[PDB]
Amino acid sequence: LSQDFVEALKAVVGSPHVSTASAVREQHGHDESMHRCQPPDAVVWPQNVDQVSRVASLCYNQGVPIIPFGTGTGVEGGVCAVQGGVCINLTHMDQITELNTEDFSVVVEPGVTRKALNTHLRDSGLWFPVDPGADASLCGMAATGASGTNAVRYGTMRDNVINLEVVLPDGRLLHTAGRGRHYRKSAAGYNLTGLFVGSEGTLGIITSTTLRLHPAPEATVAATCAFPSVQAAVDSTVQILQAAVPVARIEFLDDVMMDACNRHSKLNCPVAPTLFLEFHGSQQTLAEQLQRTEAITQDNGGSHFSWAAEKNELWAARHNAWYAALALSPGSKAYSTDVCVPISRLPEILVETKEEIKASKLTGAIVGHVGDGNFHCILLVDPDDAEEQRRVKAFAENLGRRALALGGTCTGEHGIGLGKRQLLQEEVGPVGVETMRQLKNTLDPRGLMNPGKVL
């Protein structure tokens, strides 16, 4: 980057909000994944959407790649600057606006996290349910198409994003569903909002998201249930879904993950394949769901439910499973798989994955949003041992391909980033790939919007 270009950036955002210092760039060259740190040439913090537009147009017309950066909690290398360029950290735009409690909607800027939003909504009777374990940017969650433990009942980001404000790569401002609009359904034209959810910063910069809010549950009950085997836990899961019990959360932990979480969080659950469950409803609604769910789990060998206000501890431990797995081998990094399959095929692939981790020299813990047919294999890697890194990559690719063989997808929520680009080509085939590329090319003709990712 030339000093003329750096001074032009400073003219837009202000001298304090541009940095070419190596330490600042290195901090913005990686996320939480094992993908090697690739530092951008500069980091820029725009203060309002006009500045985002002017930064993008400056980069775009000068041939400088743009990397949108939220909270850097992604796990597929989305923020790695594989071709250099300007990292745009969006978190100084941190305001909540247009809170419309009577319409169940709110507008947030990229610096707002889910925790910040739900704190703002305390005593409103409303909450935002999509819950990645990390304290992530909500606009980042829109960009990756995130989900979480609550998705089985309340939907993913795709279900709960109503509208997006997007700075296109050349600086034009798009409101995907129209400026200020919010509604429950529309057939007006082509649905542009869904194109930008899950685009990972390769189609434009999300500068605000309009989110669907939900009523807080009348009553809540949480529980854990220990099983004799992985098969018994996943069969119970499938049978619960096929019986249409509207569970609020249904999370699976294998024995390795249960032990890891015990050690990391001062939980002390029996070390066994375990379901964490949560139910929402009225008093009698809960009782009926509990009875039907306990009957199914018992038939598969489940323990009596170990019940859980502050006992928040349960789900905080789950949300930190990524770090619990890391702590099994301090100094390691982690790679996660993220397949999602037709639910009737979930038992076969989860059991086969357990058998394959056991038969291998890798350390892996299994944790999953199994109510969606989705699970994570969290594989640890020595950042220095390459033989291991190649064994971890090969394991993840084989798992991905088995999921594709079953009619599923290689990622339910984390995205493609750098890691799953070949699997995506296998998943949608040549006409799917060319169609996605044609969309990328019309929005980003010069290929400068987070290059090297997804496609």
Ligand SMILES: Cc1cc2nc3c(=O)[nH]c(=O)nc-3n(C[C@H](O)[C@H](O)[C@H](O)COP(=O)(O)OP(=O)(O)OC[C@H]3O[C@@H](n4cnc5c(N)ncnc54)[C@H](O)[C@@H]3O)c2cc1C
């Ligand atoms: C402990 C832990 C638990 C997690 N649990 C979950 C989980 O349950 N579910 C889940 O889905 N994910 C989960 N994640 C992954 C991560 O939190 C999500 O993918 C999240 O959506 C990333 O948001 P971010 O702003 O931190 O992303 P970043 O790493 O900053 O960016 C991710 C990608 O999105 C792009 N991007 C970011 N912000 C924008 C923007 N405003 N406009 C356009 N593009 C943008 C970036 O360029 C990059 O390609 C977890 C991560 C951790 C560390």
Ligand SMILES: [Mn+2]
């Ligand atoms: Mn997850």
